[PDB]
């Protein structure tokens, strides 16, 4: 068995290997990459996403989100308070202000210590989930706006044509902006490109151990667990590496820098934080190997998780028994 310890693997494809996206994902899996739940891909030196980032300041962040924490430093939830619209130039100036800017630090490990010590005492503002793309239309390789769609994958594997579309999303971050513990909708893959700015630190649980994280989460968030049998779908809970180690949960960590891709694999729980002002692009995708994960994915039916239009058909075709209850949650 390849990668039996479930370590995060790092890949360096050549320009020739960067042509065929599907084939390269399947290669990474032949080497055991999926067992970690997360992989890093460093693009060939010949490649670029676009020519410059000098002209992005007029993008609008219609609903910036203030991430307010509750709990203790290592075990907390966050709620998202909606703020007034602002441009990316306005948001960058806010990120760099004395109130929000990255503190002085020695290295990534010192900044990680500071994050876990102090995150709950501040409320950073995140521009999340903004439909759009920063890839140039002439970038042919690993262009996250030109991937094969999940609807086409389902149709190719299973024969059923379905409605829905699959487009990328932009994220503008600042120091301490946080992504809570989650798997993707319908336990899909994700791919994330860090276009510019400061790093993003990731934590991940191997897919084969995801239920260990769920059992810990039920113990640490007992009211939330009573409210919903899949409350991590709400994407609000944080648990620190120190707490995971104290409870014997297998995990790994890695820092993504500008110019690098990360892939998350089906049922790979992940969480993390941004080091300073940055911009990332991400999209969900599928392969043949995903179908069985999609058929088994948990679902939130309490009404909190509220998701995209295109998840309807995935539940309807892959999980017809659960469809009626899930849809009640959506209405
Ligand atoms: O970058 C972020 O805030 C969150 N991204 C992801 O969870 C992802 O790409 O799957
Ligand atoms: Mg602009
Ligand atoms: Ni994710
Ligand atoms: Zn729920």
Curated annotation (Swiss-Prot):
One of its GO terms (biological process) is regulation of protein phosphorylation. Residues 136-302 form the JmjC domain. 2-oxoglutarate binds at residues 126, 192, 200, 235. Disulfide bonds: none annotated. It comes from the Eukaryota. One of its GO terms (molecular function) is histone H3K9 demethylase activity. Its main location: nucleus. Residues 8-50 form the JmjN domain. Binds 1 Fe(2+) ion per subunit. Keywords: ADP-ribosylation, Chromatin regulator, Dioxygenase, Iron, Metal-binding, Nucleus, Oxidoreductase, Transcription, Transcription regulation, Ubl conjugation, Zinc. Zn(2+) binds at residues 228, 234, 300, 302. It catalyses: N(6),N(6),N(6)-trimethyl-L-lysyl(9)-[histone H3] + 2 2-oxoglutarate + 2 O2 = N(6)-methyl-L-lysyl(9)-[histone H3] + 2 formaldehyde + 2 succinate + 2 CO2. The modification PolyADP-ribosyl glutamic acid is found at residues 16-17. Ubiquitinated via 'Lys-63'-linked ubiquitin chains. Deubiquitinated by USP14 with the help of TRIM14 leading to stabilization. One of its GO terms (cellular component) is nucleoplasm. Its EC number is 1.14.11.66. It is an enzyme of class 1 (oxidoreductase). Histone demethylase that specifically demethylates 'Lys-9' of histone H3, thereby playing a central role in histone code. Does not demethylate histone H3 'Lys-4', H3 'Lys-27', H3 'Lys-36' nor H4 'Lys-20'. Demethylates both di- and trimethylated H3 'Lys-9' residue, while it has no activity on monomethylated residues. Demethylation of Lys residue generates formaldehyde and succinate. Belongs to the JHDM3 histone demethylase family. This is Lysine-specific demethylase 4D. The gene is KDM4D. The chain holds residues 11 to 341 of 523 of the full protein.
């Amino acid at each position: 068995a390849q990668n039996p310890n479930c370590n995060i693997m790092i890949f360096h494809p050549t320009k020739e290997e960067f042509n065929d996206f599907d084939k390269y994902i399947a290669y990474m899996e032949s080497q055991g990459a999926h067992r970690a739940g997360l992989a890093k891909i460093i693009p060939p030196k010949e490649w670029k996403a676009r020519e410059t980032y000098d002209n992005i300041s007029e993008i609008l962040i219609a609903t910036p989100l203030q991430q307010v924490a509750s709990g203790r430093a290592g075990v907390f939830t966050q709620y998202h308070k909606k703020k007034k619209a602002m441009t990316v130039g306005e948001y960058r100036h806010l990120a760099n202000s004395k109130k929000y800017q990255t503190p002085p630090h020695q290295n990534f490990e010192d900044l990680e210590r500071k994050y876990w010590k102090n995150r709950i005492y501040n409320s950073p503002i995140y521009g999340a989930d903004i439909s759009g793309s920063l890839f140039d239309e002439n970038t042919k390789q690993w262009n996250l706006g030109h991937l094969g769609t999940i609807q086409d994958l389902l149709e190719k594997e299973c024969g059923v044509v379905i409605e829905g579309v699959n487009t990328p999303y932009l994220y503008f971050g600042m120091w301490k902006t946080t992504f809570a513990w989650h798997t993707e909708d319908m336990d899909l893959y994700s791919i994330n490109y860090l276009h510019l700015g400061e790093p993003k630190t990731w934590y991940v649980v191997p897919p084969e151990h995801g239920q260990r994280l769920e059992r810990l989460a039920r113990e640490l968030f007992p009211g939330s667990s009573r409210g919903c049998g899949a409350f991590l779908r709400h994407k609000v809970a944080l648990i620190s590496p120190t707490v995971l180690k104290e409870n014997g949960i297998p995990f790994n960590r890695i820092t993504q820098e500008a110019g690098e891709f990360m892939v998350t694999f089906p049922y790979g729980y992940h969480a993390g934080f941004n080091h300073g002002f940055n911009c990332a692009e991400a999209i969900n995708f599928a392969t043949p190997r995903w179908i069985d994960y999609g058929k088994m994915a948990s679902q939130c039916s309490c009404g909190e998780a509220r998701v995209t239009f295109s998840m309807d058909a995935f539940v309807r075709i892959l999980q017809p028994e659960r469809y009626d209850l899930w849809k009640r949650g959506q209405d």
